[PDB]
Amino acid sequence: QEEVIALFEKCRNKYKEGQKKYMEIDEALNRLHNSLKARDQNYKNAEK
Amino acid sequence: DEEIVKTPRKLVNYVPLKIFNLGDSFDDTITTTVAKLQDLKKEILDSPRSN
């Protein structure tokens, strides 16, 4: 039972760190998407 | 019985001892850590999981 409860502790820690990474990557991806759209519009205007 | 009469004894000869009275076997500290882990995992169960 001690091994299994320690297994759950490490499982929950890995779960929380995975969600932290997932939020970080999703936030970065959304910011990059919006920035890319803005940069595309800016480049099209400048080229024209 | 022993020898011919009762064995000599000191006038007080208390010697309380009796540190343990039966039981023994399973230790209490290991299961104390077990119970602490039990309440800790219950507190974790209170915290949200999944979703």
PDB file of N, CA and C in Angstrom:
ATOM      1  N   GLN A   1       0.817  -1.209   0.000  1.00  0.00           N
ATOM      2  CA  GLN A   1       0.000   0.000   0.000  1.00  0.00           C
ATOM      3  C   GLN A   1       0.853   1.262   0.000  1.00  0.00           C
ATOM      4  N   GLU A   2       1.991   1.245   0.698  1.00  0.00           N
ATOM      5  CA  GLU A   2       2.886   2.396   0.669  1.00  0.00           C
ATOM      6  C   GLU A   2       3.423   2.634  -0.736  1.00  0.00           C
ATOM      7  N   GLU A   3       3.806   1.563  -1.434  1.00  0.00           N
ATOM      8  CA  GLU A   3       4.304   1.721  -2.795  1.00  0.00           C
ATOM      9  C   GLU A   3       3.218   2.269  -3.710  1.00  0.00           C
ATOM     10  N   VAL A   4       1.981   1.791  -3.554  1.00  0.00           N
ATOM     11  CA  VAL A   4       0.901   2.245  -4.427  1.00  0.00           C
ATOM     12  C   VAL A   4       0.538   3.699  -4.135  1.00  0.00           C
ATOM     13  N   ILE A   5       0.551   4.103  -2.863  1.00  0.00           N
ATOM     14  CA  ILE A   5       0.241   5.498  -2.554  1.00  0.00           C
ATOM     15  C   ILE A   5       1.358   6.418  -3.040  1.00  0.00           C
ATOM     16  N   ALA A   6       2.617   5.976  -2.939  1.00  0.00           N
ATOM     17  CA  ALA A   6       3.708   6.751  -3.526  1.00  0.00           C
ATOM     18  C   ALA A   6       3.582   6.802  -5.043  1.00  0.00           C
ATOM     19  N   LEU A   7       3.101   5.714  -5.645  1.00  0.00           N
ATOM     20  CA  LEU A   7       2.839   5.699  -7.076  1.00  0.00           C
ATOM     21  C   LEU A   7       1.778   6.724  -7.443  1.00  0.00           C
ATOM     22  N   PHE A   8       0.723   6.832  -6.637  1.00  0.00           N
ATOM     23  CA  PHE A   8      -0.293   7.843  -6.906  1.00  0.00           C
ATOM     24  C   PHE A   8       0.260   9.246  -6.713  1.00  0.00           C
ATOM     25  N   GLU A   9       1.134   9.430  -5.723  1.00  0.00           N
ATOM     26  CA  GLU A   9       1.735  10.743  -5.510  1.00  0.00           C
ATOM     27  C   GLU A   9       2.566  11.163  -6.719  1.00  0.00           C
ATOM     28  N   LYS A  10       3.437  10.271  -7.198  1.00  0.00           N
ATOM     29  CA  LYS A  10       4.225  10.593  -8.383  1.00  0.00           C
ATOM     30  C   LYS A  10       3.344  10.727  -9.620  1.00  0.00           C
ATOM     31  N   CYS A  11       2.279   9.928  -9.716  1.00  0.00           N
ATOM     32  CA  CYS A  11       1.357  10.034 -10.840  1.00  0.00           C
ATOM     33  C   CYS A  11       0.665  11.389 -10.860  1.00  0.00           C
ATOM     34  N   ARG A  12       0.212  11.861  -9.699  1.00  0.00           N
ATOM     35  CA  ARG A  12      -0.461  13.152  -9.631  1.00  0.00           C
ATOM     36  C   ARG A  12       0.517  14.294  -9.875  1.00  0.00           C
ATOM     37  N   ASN A  13       1.757  14.161  -9.396  1.00  0.00           N
ATOM     38  CA  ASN A  13       2.759  15.182  -9.687  1.00  0.00           C
ATOM     39  C   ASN A  13       3.061  15.253 -11.180  1.00  0.00           C
ATOM     40  N   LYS A  14       3.226  14.095 -11.828  1.00  0.00           N
ATOM     41  CA  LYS A  14       3.444  14.078 -13.270  1.00  0.00           C
ATOM     42  C   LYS A  14       2.229  14.619 -14.011  1.00  0.00           C
ATOM     43  N   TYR A  15       1.030  14.327 -13.509  1.00  0.00           N
ATOM     44  CA  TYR A  15      -0.196  14.832 -14.115  1.00  0.00           C
ATOM     45  C   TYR A  15      -0.249  16.354 -14.058  1.00  0.00           C
ATOM     46  N   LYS A  16       0.059  16.922 -12.890  1.00  0.00           N
ATOM     47  CA  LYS A  16       0.057  18.371 -12.736  1.00  0.00           C
ATOM     48  C   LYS A  16       1.131  19.023 -13.598  1.00  0.00           C
ATOM     49  N   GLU A  17       2.328  18.430 -13.652  1.00  0.00           N
ATOM     50  CA  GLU A  17       3.388  19.022 -14.465  1.00  0.00           C
ATOM     51  C   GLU A  17       3.076  18.895 -15.953  1.00  0.00           C
ATOM     52  N   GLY A  18       2.426  17.801 -16.354  1.00  0.00           N
ATOM     53  CA  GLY A  18       2.001  17.667 -17.733  1.00  0.00           C
ATOM     54  C   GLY A  18       0.959  18.697 -18.112  1.00  0.00           C
ATOM     55  N   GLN A  19       0.011  18.968 -17.211  1.00  0.00           N
ATOM     56  CA  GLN A  19      -0.963  20.018 -17.493  1.00  0.00           C
ATOM     57  C   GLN A  19      -0.317  21.397 -17.516  1.00  0.00           C
ATOM     58  N   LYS A  20       0.665  21.635 -16.647  1.00  0.00           N
ATOM     59  CA  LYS A  20       1.385  22.903 -16.707  1.00  0.00           C
ATOM     60  C   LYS A  20       2.084  23.067 -18.050  1.00  0.00           C
ATOM     61  N   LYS A  21       2.746  22.009 -18.523  1.00  0.00           N
ATOM     62  CA  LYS A  21       3.387  22.058 -19.832  1.00  0.00           C
ATOM     63  C   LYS A  21       2.361  22.255 -20.942  1.00  0.00           C
ATOM     64  N   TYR A  22       1.202  21.602 -20.822  1.00  0.00           N
ATOM     65  CA  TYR A  22       0.175  21.698 -21.854  1.00  0.00           C
ATOM     66  C   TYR A  22      -0.396  23.110 -21.936  1.00  0.00           C
ATOM     67  N   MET A  23      -0.674  23.728 -20.785  1.00  0.00           N
ATOM     68  CA  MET A  23      -1.082  25.133 -20.763  1.00  0.00           C
ATOM     69  C   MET A  23      -0.007  26.052 -21.328  1.00  0.00           C
ATOM     70  N   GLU A  24       1.258  25.837 -20.952  1.00  0.00           N
ATOM     71  CA  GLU A  24       2.322  26.688 -21.479  1.00  0.00           C
ATOM     72  C   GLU A  24       2.408  26.584 -22.996  1.00  0.00           C
ATOM     73  N   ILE A  25       2.362  25.360 -23.524  1.00  0.00           N
ATOM     74  CA  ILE A  25       2.505  25.158 -24.960  1.00  0.00           C
ATOM     75  C   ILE A  25       1.280  25.675 -25.704  1.00  0.00           C
ATOM     76  N   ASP A  26       0.082  25.470 -25.151  1.00  0.00           N
ATOM     77  CA  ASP A  26      -1.123  25.967 -25.806  1.00  0.00           C
ATOM     78  C   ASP A  26      -1.147  27.490 -25.832  1.00  0.00           C
ATOM     79  N   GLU A  27      -0.750  28.126 -24.727  1.00  0.00           N
ATOM     80  CA  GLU A  27      -0.674  29.581 -24.687  1.00  0.00           C
ATOM     81  C   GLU A  27       0.342  30.102 -25.694  1.00  0.00           C
ATOM     82  N   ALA A  28       1.516  29.464 -25.756  1.00  0.00           N
ATOM     83  CA  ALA A  28       2.525  29.866 -26.728  1.00  0.00           C
ATOM     84  C   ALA A  28       2.015  29.699 -28.153  1.00  0.00           C
ATOM     85  N   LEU A  29       1.304  28.603 -28.424  1.00  0.00           N
ATOM     86  CA  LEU A  29       0.808  28.352 -29.771  1.00  0.00           C
ATOM     87  C   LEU A  29      -0.262  29.359 -30.169  1.00  0.00           C
ATOM     88  N   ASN A  30      -1.172  29.690 -29.251  1.00  0.00           N
ATOM     89  CA  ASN A  30      -2.193  30.687 -29.561  1.00  0.00           C
ATOM     90  C   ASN A  30      -1.569  32.057 -29.802  1.00  0.00           C
ATOM     91  N   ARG A  31      -0.607  32.443 -28.958  1.00  0.00           N
ATOM     92  CA  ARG A  31       0.073  33.716 -29.161  1.00  0.00           C
ATOM     93  C   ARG A  31       0.812  33.735 -30.492  1.00  0.00           C
ATOM     94  N   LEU A  32       1.481  32.632 -30.836  1.00  0.00           N
ATOM     95  CA  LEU A  32       2.193  32.564 -32.105  1.00  0.00           C
ATOM     96  C   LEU A  32       1.234  32.628 -33.285  1.00  0.00           C
ATOM     97  N   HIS A  33       0.068  31.992 -33.172  1.00  0.00           N
ATOM     98  CA  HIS A  33      -0.916  32.043 -34.250  1.00  0.00           C
ATOM     99  C   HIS A  33      -1.400  33.468 -34.484  1.00  0.00           C
ATOM    100  N   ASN A  34      -1.779  34.161 -33.407  1.00  0.00           N
ATOM    101  CA  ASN A  34      -2.243  35.539 -33.560  1.00  0.00           C
ATOM    102  C   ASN A  34      -1.133  36.440 -34.089  1.00  0.00           C
ATOM    103  N   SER A  35       0.089  36.264 -33.576  1.00  0.00           N
ATOM    104  CA  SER A  35       1.215  37.058 -34.046  1.00  0.00           C
ATOM    105  C   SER A  35       1.502  36.791 -35.515  1.00  0.00           C
ATOM    106  N   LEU A  36       1.393  35.532 -35.944  1.00  0.00           N
ATOM    107  CA  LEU A  36       1.624  35.199 -37.344  1.00  0.00           C
ATOM    108  C   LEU A  36       0.587  35.847 -38.244  1.00  0.00           C
ATOM    109  N   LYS A  37      -0.680  35.843 -37.827  1.00  0.00           N
ATOM    110  CA  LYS A  37      -1.702  36.500 -38.640  1.00  0.00           C
ATOM    111  C   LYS A  37      -1.441  38.000 -38.745  1.00  0.00           C
ATOM    112  N   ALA A  38      -1.090  38.634 -37.622  1.00  0.00           N
ATOM    113  CA  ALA A  38      -0.778  40.061 -37.650  1.00  0.00           C
ATOM    114  C   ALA A  38       0.427  40.350 -38.539  1.00  0.00           C
ATOM    115  N   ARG A  39       1.473  39.527 -38.436  1.00  0.00           N
ATOM    116  CA  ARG A  39       2.670  39.728 -39.245  1.00  0.00           C
ATOM    117  C   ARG A  39       2.381  39.511 -40.721  1.00  0.00           C
ATOM    118  N   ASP A  40       1.511  38.553 -41.043  1.00  0.00           N
ATOM    119  CA  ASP A  40       1.138  38.329 -42.434  1.00  0.00           C
ATOM    120  C   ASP A  40       0.429  39.549 -43.006  1.00  0.00           C
ATOM    121  N   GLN A  41      -0.514  40.115 -42.246  1.00  0.00           N
ATOM    122  CA  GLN A  41      -1.184  41.325 -42.716  1.00  0.00           C
ATOM    123  C   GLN A  41      -0.195  42.475 -42.878  1.00  0.00           C
ATOM    124  N   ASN A  42       0.710  42.641 -41.908  1.00  0.00           N
ATOM    125  CA  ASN A  42       1.698  43.711 -41.987  1.00  0.00           C
ATOM    126  C   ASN A  42       2.591  43.551 -43.210  1.00  0.00           C
ATOM    127  N   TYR A  43       3.064  42.329 -43.464  1.00  0.00           N
ATOM    128  CA  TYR A  43       3.938  42.093 -44.607  1.00  0.00           C
ATOM    129  C   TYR A  43       3.209  42.319 -45.920  1.00  0.00           C
ATOM    130  N   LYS A  44       1.947  41.894 -46.011  1.00  0.00           N
ATOM    131  CA  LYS A  44       1.197  42.138 -47.238  1.00  0.00           C
ATOM    132  C   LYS A  44       1.034  43.630 -47.489  1.00  0.00           C
ATOM    133  N   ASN A  45       0.701  44.395 -46.444  1.00  0.00           N
ATOM    134  CA  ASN A  45       0.561  45.839 -46.613  1.00  0.00           C
ATOM    135  C   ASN A  45       1.879  46.476 -47.034  1.00  0.00           C
ATOM    136  N   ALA A  46       2.980  46.085 -46.385  1.00  0.00           N
ATOM    137  CA  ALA A  46       4.276  46.673 -46.707  1.00  0.00           C
ATOM    138  C   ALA A  46       4.702  46.335 -48.127  1.00  0.00           C
ATOM    139  N   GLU A  47       4.507  45.082 -48.543  1.00  0.00           N
ATOM    140  CA  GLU A  47       4.871  44.687 -49.897  1.00  0.00           C
ATOM    141  C   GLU A  47       4.052  45.448 -50.927  1.00  0.00           C
ATOM    142  N   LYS A  48       2.743  45.575 -50.698  1.00  0.00           N
ATOM    143  CA  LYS A  48       1.916  46.318 -51.642  1.00  0.00           C
ATOM    144  C   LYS A  48       2.356  47.772 -51.731  1.00  0.00           C
TER     145      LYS A  48
ATOM    146  N   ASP B   1       7.712 -28.958  44.816  1.00  0.00           N
ATOM    147  CA  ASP B   1       8.007 -27.542  44.669  1.00  0.00           C
ATOM    148  C   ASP B   1       9.515 -27.304  44.700  1.00  0.00           C
ATOM    149  N   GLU B   2       9.903 -26.035  44.589  1.00  0.00           N
ATOM    150  CA  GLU B   2      11.314 -25.678  44.615  1.00  0.00           C
ATOM    151  C   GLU B   2      11.911 -25.952  45.989  1.00  0.00           C
ATOM    152  N   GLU B   3      13.163 -26.426  45.992  1.00  0.00           N
ATOM    153  CA  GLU B   3      13.916 -26.825  47.182  1.00  0.00           C
ATOM    154  C   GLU B   3      13.029 -27.468  48.244  1.00  0.00           C
ATOM    155  N   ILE B   4      13.162 -27.033  49.493  1.00  0.00           N
ATOM    156  CA  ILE B   4      12.367 -27.569  50.590  1.00  0.00           C
ATOM    157  C   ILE B   4      11.302 -26.581  51.051  1.00  0.00           C
ATOM    158  N   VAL B   5      11.576 -25.281  50.946  1.00  0.00           N
ATOM    159  CA  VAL B   5      10.661 -24.234  51.372  1.00  0.00           C
ATOM    160  C   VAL B   5      10.583 -23.178  50.273  1.00  0.00           C
ATOM    161  N   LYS B   6       9.835 -22.112  50.552  1.00  0.00           N
ATOM    162  CA  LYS B   6       9.735 -21.005  49.611  1.00  0.00           C
ATOM    163  C   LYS B   6      11.084 -20.313  49.462  1.00  0.00           C
ATOM    164  N   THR B   7      11.379 -19.872  48.243  1.00  0.00           N
ATOM    165  CA  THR B   7      12.655 -19.226  47.976  1.00  0.00           C
ATOM    166  C   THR B   7      12.739 -17.893  48.721  1.00  0.00           C
ATOM    167  N   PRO B   8      13.921 -17.519  49.212  1.00  0.00           N
ATOM    168  CA  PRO B   8      14.057 -16.222  49.884  1.00  0.00           C
ATOM    169  C   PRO B   8      13.791 -15.070  48.926  1.00  0.00           C
ATOM    170  N   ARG B   9      13.199 -14.007  49.466  1.00  0.00           N
ATOM    171  CA  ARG B   9      12.855 -12.830  48.685  1.00  0.00           C
ATOM    172  C   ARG B   9      13.281 -11.583  49.444  1.00  0.00           C
ATOM    173  N   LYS B  10      13.628 -10.540  48.694  1.00  0.00           N
ATOM    174  CA  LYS B  10      13.972  -9.266  49.304  1.00  0.00           C
ATOM    175  C   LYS B  10      12.747  -8.658  49.977  1.00  0.00           C
ATOM    176  N   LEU B  11      12.998  -7.837  51.000  1.00  0.00           N
ATOM    177  CA  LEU B  11      11.907  -7.268  51.782  1.00  0.00           C
ATOM    178  C   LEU B  11      11.012  -6.352  50.956  1.00  0.00           C
ATOM    179  N   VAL B  12      11.519  -5.793  49.857  1.00  0.00           N
ATOM    180  CA  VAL B  12      10.685  -5.003  48.959  1.00  0.00           C
ATOM    181  C   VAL B  12      10.525  -5.744  47.639  1.00  0.00           C
ATOM    182  N   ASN B  13      11.637  -5.924  46.924  1.00  0.00           N
ATOM    183  CA  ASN B  13      11.697  -6.658  45.657  1.00  0.00           C
ATOM    184  C   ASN B  13      10.492  -6.358  44.767  1.00  0.00           C
ATOM    185  N   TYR B  14      10.305  -5.074  44.458  1.00  0.00           N
ATOM    186  CA  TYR B  14       9.172  -4.684  43.624  1.00  0.00           C
ATOM    187  C   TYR B  14       9.409  -5.067  42.169  1.00  0.00           C
ATOM    188  N   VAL B  15      10.418  -4.464  41.543  1.00  0.00           N
ATOM    189  CA  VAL B  15      10.774  -4.715  40.146  1.00  0.00           C
ATOM    190  C   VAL B  15       9.527  -4.579  39.280  1.00  0.00           C
ATOM    191  N   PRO B  16       9.031  -3.360  39.047  1.00  0.00           N
ATOM    192  CA  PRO B  16       7.780  -3.222  38.277  1.00  0.00           C
ATOM    193  C   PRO B  16       7.883  -3.748  36.855  1.00  0.00           C
ATOM    194  N   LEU B  17       8.862  -3.268  36.084  1.00  0.00           N
ATOM    195  CA  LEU B  17       9.051  -3.667  34.693  1.00  0.00           C
ATOM    196  C   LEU B  17       7.773  -3.483  33.884  1.00  0.00           C
ATOM    197  N   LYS B  18       7.148  -4.602  33.498  1.00  0.00           N
ATOM    198  CA  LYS B  18       5.895  -4.659  32.743  1.00  0.00           C
ATOM    199  C   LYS B  18       5.810  -3.592  31.657  1.00  0.00           C
ATOM    200  N   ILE B  19       6.907  -3.391  30.925  1.00  0.00           N
ATOM    201  CA  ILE B  19       6.914  -2.404  29.849  1.00  0.00           C
ATOM    202  C   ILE B  19       5.909  -2.788  28.772  1.00  0.00           C
ATOM    203  N   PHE B  20       5.881  -4.063  28.396  1.00  0.00           N
ATOM    204  CA  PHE B  20       4.930  -4.583  27.423  1.00  0.00           C
ATOM    205  C   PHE B  20       4.023  -5.593  28.108  1.00  0.00           C
ATOM    206  N   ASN B  21       2.728  -5.522  27.810  1.00  0.00           N
ATOM    207  CA  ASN B  21       1.732  -6.449  28.344  1.00  0.00           C
ATOM    208  C   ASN B  21       1.048  -7.115  27.154  1.00  0.00           C
ATOM    209  N   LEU B  22       1.574  -8.267  26.754  1.00  0.00           N
ATOM    210  CA  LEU B  22       1.075  -9.038  25.607  1.00  0.00           C
ATOM    211  C   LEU B  22       1.199  -8.159  24.358  1.00  0.00           C
ATOM    212  N   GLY B  23       0.326  -8.370  23.375  1.00  0.00           N
ATOM    213  CA  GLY B  23       0.370  -7.600  22.149  1.00  0.00           C
ATOM    214  C   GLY B  23       1.647  -7.805  21.362  1.00  0.00           C
ATOM    215  N   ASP B  24       2.483  -6.769  21.309  1.00  0.00           N
ATOM    216  CA  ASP B  24       3.778  -6.794  20.612  1.00  0.00           C
ATOM    217  C   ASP B  24       3.500  -7.104  19.143  1.00  0.00           C
ATOM    218  N   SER B  25       4.219  -8.041  18.520  1.00  0.00           N
ATOM    219  CA  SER B  25       3.995  -8.435  17.133  1.00  0.00           C
ATOM    220  C   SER B  25       4.081  -7.244  16.187  1.00  0.00           C
ATOM    221  N   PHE B  26       2.929  -6.758  15.731  1.00  0.00           N
ATOM    222  CA  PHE B  26       2.899  -5.658  14.779  1.00  0.00           C
ATOM    223  C   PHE B  26       3.331  -4.359  15.450  1.00  0.00           C
ATOM    224  N   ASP B  27       4.256  -3.648  14.810  1.00  0.00           N
ATOM    225  CA  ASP B  27       4.729  -2.381  15.343  1.00  0.00           C
ATOM    226  C   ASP B  27       3.680  -1.294  15.139  1.00  0.00           C
ATOM    227  N   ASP B  28       3.752  -0.260  15.975  1.00  0.00           N
ATOM    228  CA  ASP B  28       2.788   0.830  15.912  1.00  0.00           C
ATOM    229  C   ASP B  28       3.276   2.009  15.082  1.00  0.00           C
ATOM    230  N   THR B  29       4.594   2.186  14.947  1.00  0.00           N
ATOM    231  CA  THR B  29       5.114   3.336  14.213  1.00  0.00           C
ATOM    232  C   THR B  29       4.901   3.190  12.709  1.00  0.00           C
ATOM    233  N   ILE B  30       5.070   1.975  12.179  1.00  0.00           N
ATOM    234  CA  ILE B  30       4.877   1.760  10.746  1.00  0.00           C
ATOM    235  C   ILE B  30       3.424   2.013  10.361  1.00  0.00           C
ATOM    236  N   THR B  31       2.489   1.456  11.129  1.00  0.00           N
ATOM    237  CA  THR B  31       1.083   1.731  10.860  1.00  0.00           C
ATOM    238  C   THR B  31       0.707   3.166  11.223  1.00  0.00           C
ATOM    239  N   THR B  32       1.499   3.841  12.063  1.00  0.00           N
ATOM    240  CA  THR B  32       1.264   5.265  12.298  1.00  0.00           C
ATOM    241  C   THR B  32       1.589   6.081  11.057  1.00  0.00           C
ATOM    242  N   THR B  33       2.717   5.772  10.421  1.00  0.00           N
ATOM    243  CA  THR B  33       3.020   6.366   9.124  1.00  0.00           C
ATOM    244  C   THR B  33       1.951   6.002   8.098  1.00  0.00           C
ATOM    245  N   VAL B  34       1.425   4.778   8.179  1.00  0.00           N
ATOM    246  CA  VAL B  34       0.357   4.357   7.269  1.00  0.00           C
ATOM    247  C   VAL B  34      -0.888   5.217   7.462  1.00  0.00           C
ATOM    248  N   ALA B  35      -1.276   5.462   8.715  1.00  0.00           N
ATOM    249  CA  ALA B  35      -2.458   6.277   8.992  1.00  0.00           C
ATOM    250  C   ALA B  35      -2.240   7.732   8.591  1.00  0.00           C
ATOM    251  N   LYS B  36      -1.025   8.246   8.801  1.00  0.00           N
ATOM    252  CA  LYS B  36      -0.708   9.594   8.341  1.00  0.00           C
ATOM    253  C   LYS B  36      -0.837   9.689   6.826  1.00  0.00           C
ATOM    254  N   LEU B  37      -0.314   8.691   6.112  1.00  0.00           N
ATOM    255  CA  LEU B  37      -0.475   8.656   4.664  1.00  0.00           C
ATOM    256  C   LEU B  37      -1.938   8.508   4.272  1.00  0.00           C
ATOM    257  N   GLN B  38      -2.732   7.822   5.096  1.00  0.00           N
ATOM    258  CA  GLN B  38      -4.157   7.677   4.818  1.00  0.00           C
ATOM    259  C   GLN B  38      -4.867   9.023   4.876  1.00  0.00           C
ATOM    260  N   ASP B  39      -4.632   9.788   5.942  1.00  0.00           N
ATOM    261  CA  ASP B  39      -5.274  11.100   6.011  1.00  0.00           C
ATOM    262  C   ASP B  39      -4.723  12.040   4.942  1.00  0.00           C
ATOM    263  N   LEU B  40      -3.436  11.913   4.606  1.00  0.00           N
ATOM    264  CA  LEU B  40      -2.866  12.729   3.538  1.00  0.00           C
ATOM    265  C   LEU B  40      -3.513  12.413   2.192  1.00  0.00           C
ATOM    266  N   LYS B  41      -3.725  11.127   1.894  1.00  0.00           N
ATOM    267  CA  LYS B  41      -4.340  10.764   0.622  1.00  0.00           C
ATOM    268  C   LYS B  41      -5.820  11.118   0.606  1.00  0.00           C
ATOM    269  N   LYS B  42      -6.475  11.113   1.770  1.00  0.00           N
ATOM    270  CA  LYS B  42      -7.843  11.622   1.827  1.00  0.00           C
ATOM    271  C   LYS B  42      -7.881  13.116   1.519  1.00  0.00           C
ATOM    272  N   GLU B  43      -6.937  13.877   2.081  1.00  0.00           N
ATOM    273  CA  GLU B  43      -6.853  15.302   1.773  1.00  0.00           C
ATOM    274  C   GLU B  43      -6.574  15.527   0.292  1.00  0.00           C
ATOM    275  N   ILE B  44      -5.744  14.671  -0.309  1.00  0.00           N
ATOM    276  CA  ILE B  44      -5.519  14.740  -1.750  1.00  0.00           C
ATOM    277  C   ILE B  44      -6.808  14.441  -2.510  1.00  0.00           C
ATOM    278  N   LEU B  45      -7.572  13.442  -2.061  1.00  0.00           N
ATOM    279  CA  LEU B  45      -8.857  13.137  -2.682  1.00  0.00           C
ATOM    280  C   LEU B  45      -9.795  14.334  -2.615  1.00  0.00           C
ATOM    281  N   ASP B  46      -9.685  15.139  -1.555  1.00  0.00           N
ATOM    282  CA  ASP B  46     -10.459  16.375  -1.495  1.00  0.00           C
ATOM    283  C   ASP B  46     -10.070  17.326  -2.624  1.00  0.00           C
ATOM    284  N   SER B  47      -8.784  17.391  -2.952  1.00  0.00           N
ATOM    285  CA  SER B  47      -8.344  18.244  -4.046  1.00  0.00           C
ATOM    286  C   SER B  47      -8.852  17.687  -5.375  1.00  0.00           C
ATOM    287  N   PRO B  48      -9.115  18.542  -6.364  1.00  0.00           N
ATOM    288  CA  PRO B  48      -9.657  18.051  -7.638  1.00  0.00           C
ATOM    289  C   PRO B  48      -8.684  17.123  -8.350  1.00  0.00           C
ATOM    290  N   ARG B  49      -9.244  16.132  -9.042  1.00  0.00           N
ATOM    291  CA  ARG B  49      -8.479  15.175  -9.829  1.00  0.00           C
ATOM    292  C   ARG B  49      -9.142  15.047 -11.192  1.00  0.00           C
ATOM    293  N   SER B  50      -8.328  15.056 -12.250  1.00  0.00           N
ATOM    294  CA  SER B  50      -8.798  14.968 -13.629  1.00  0.00           C
ATOM    295  C   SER B  50      -9.625  16.192 -14.002  1.00  0.00           C
ATOM    296  N   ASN B  51     -10.301  16.134 -15.153  1.00  0.00           N
ATOM    297  CA  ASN B  51     -11.154  17.185 -15.715  1.00  0.00           C
ATOM    298  C   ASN B  51     -10.508  18.565 -15.676  1.00  0.00           C
TER     299      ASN B  51
END
